[PDB]
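Structure, all six chains, one model.
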Amino acid sequence: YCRFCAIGQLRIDLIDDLEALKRFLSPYAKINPRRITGNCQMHQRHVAKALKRARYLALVPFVKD
Amino acid sequence: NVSSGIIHVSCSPNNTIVSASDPGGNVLCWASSGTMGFKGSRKKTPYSAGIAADKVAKTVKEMGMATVKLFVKGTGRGKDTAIRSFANAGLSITEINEKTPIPHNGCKPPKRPR
Amino acid sequence: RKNRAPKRTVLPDPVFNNTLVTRIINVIMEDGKKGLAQRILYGAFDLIEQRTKEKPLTVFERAVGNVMPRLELRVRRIAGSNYQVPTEVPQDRKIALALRWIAMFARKRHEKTMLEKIANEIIDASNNTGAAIKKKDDTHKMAEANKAFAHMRW
Amino acid sequence: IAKRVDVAFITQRWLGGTLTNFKTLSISINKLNKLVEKQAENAADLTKKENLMLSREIERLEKFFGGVKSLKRLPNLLIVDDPVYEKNAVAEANILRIPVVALCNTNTNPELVDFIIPANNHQPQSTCLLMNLLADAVAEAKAMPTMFAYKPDEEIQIEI
Amino acid sequence: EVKNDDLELALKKFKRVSLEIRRLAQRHEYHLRKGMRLREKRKIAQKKRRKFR
RNA sequence: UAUUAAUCUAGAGUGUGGUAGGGAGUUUUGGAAUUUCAUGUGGAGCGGUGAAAUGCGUAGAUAUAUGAAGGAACACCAGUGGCGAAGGCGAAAACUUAGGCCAUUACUGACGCUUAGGCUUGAAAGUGUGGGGAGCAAAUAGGAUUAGAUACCCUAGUAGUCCACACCGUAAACGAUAGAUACUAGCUGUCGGGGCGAUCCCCUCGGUAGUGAAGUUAACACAUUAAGUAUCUCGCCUGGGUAGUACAUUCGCAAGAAUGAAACUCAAACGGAAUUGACGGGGACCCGCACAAGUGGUGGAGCAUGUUGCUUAAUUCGAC
């Protein structure tokens, strides 16, 4: 699960945290639900919005490779 | 042609299609389930899907290719029967390229059967 | 619905000690007795031994082993357009079907010598020509055609 | 307790339709008596399957209701080691108004009986001294051994 | 999947990958009520939950 | 009880700090889809249900790849999750705005409840306008079972759709449950904060599914996430059909908004919950040559008796 919940910051943003993203993201470029990611609920929405931005940012593909 | 061209295999439950395209995009042969006279219900069976698979095989088994990518479009069983036919002929696979263009919400889908 | 019911076979002859031969004799027998069956068997065996020079036991076991089928078509209903799923045959059923095929193709025909009828039946079952080998071929062909039906169970 | 100080007991408990109505248990004790008297004659002389059937009826007696052999009435006090384990022994006894002693462990009111005992027996080290102290609190009446009432005797043992 | 060359390992994962692709394509290949369109996913999740807590 | 001056602050918020969320009006791009058009290939098919046909293709269709493009909305992200006036909220981003939640030993001095009247939005379908129409699409055209297939099956296919103005005003808008005040066991957990504390476990308050005792009840069952208890107001129902029928009202280009009978009938509500049955194109279940396998066997003949039929005095009569 995320280091952010283990340190305390109550938010995350795309500072190229791709490493931990690869733990939350399957190699299929699809966002696993809250169960796999391990966030509580708040860092869950934070990583959700970050992954969606990365989709928009082209950091992560939607499905196209 | 080159040892690694393109094989577009659009696997659909109804009349799976397949065609060997050049890297520039020019085909060399093609087939679809029911090519040998099975268009109807019996093309949708794995028998005619495998028939089309082996037809495009025998039209591509002599192209310099020994390991070829599978550009499977859609999700079904034409992929599995094509891989089985290729493996029974001694030709290995490099990757199952899932070529499904996942719906990005463009054209309106056809409505469900009433 | 019964899942297990033990079968039974009958006592062999004290010359060759084979249950298969008395089973085939007792299924091709007519009028209840072995008498005319014994006469027809003696005639068929003479007409066999005058040709196809080979040990009778070896030729008979070759015929019986090659006759045996490989598949079984137990009906299965889709509840729409029903499509059946093939199954397997136990060895006792294999032998039983073999002998019953021999009986039904050796009982009634329109050629002259029935002695020769059973003679030709045995010899052309031995030489792998189509008499009951085609049964194995078609029971394999049906399973080949039922490959899609046996793929998914409903 | 049954092998040291007892007047009547039941193997597990009442199975229902047996406590608030002892007719089904008076006939049970009478049929036990008559079954012993009748089976005293059965000596494998008619059918061995049938004498095994009779021994199995005896076995079912010990399992379901082997304890009801000497109780000819309805007991004035009924021990309940758990209100969630003695459904019939609590419910049928509470249909009438006989005094009842029960425990209360984790999920019930302590006021469902006459005298209140919040003690427990699920713990391995509890039921030992609990049962010994309950037994030796009544065993003195019948001029029978009493070794846990004020004596330093005690047990520290796991459940077995 | 994207890769498959193992004899017996990758096929089992490919099965669930194909199932996931089918579930994802069975909501936009044909237009329908969004009610059942989300109810299918919710029921799949609920069935997967209670079977293995 | 309305209360006077002062009032008391325990509420309404509000000084302040922390503060999470798909809250939202507004504005941006990105992913690609989709089908085409320039491009070439290529040999023989496409369409599909239970099976096919309607319907497409050598004058090059399938399929193909990049280039370029129209409308169009954003797989997953989607939870003992949160934010939500309802309706709802998720490719993102941000302007703005709203609601909070936790805590403030605090203030006006309780300054608030419902809502006549007034105000507001309102899923979605659809409408005039201007534009767009990518895509599917009713009605259906044609075709498949058919006794009918009009509903259910397939293709061709336009209204429709779509962007904004104006009109939409209803939904099974529900929590089958309008609220507001005050109070009331718990628990597995979990969410937002105050958090000691790798995260934690652990809690404080609000929330999020269930739980079961009181309580509640026609029963369903609810139960501190009441169908529990008391305080204040707006909406409704007095048996059913009639009965939303007719008039009329206000607005809406109209569909619709609300509203509502009479006459009559019946003595009942397709009135509800609950018990087992029948029941199913719902499942678990054990069973008998009943099937699965076969011998023979009748519908097959010589045929003989037997049924109907007929004839007739009855071709008795009953038996199906």
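Chain C touches chain B through three residues (CB under 8 Å).
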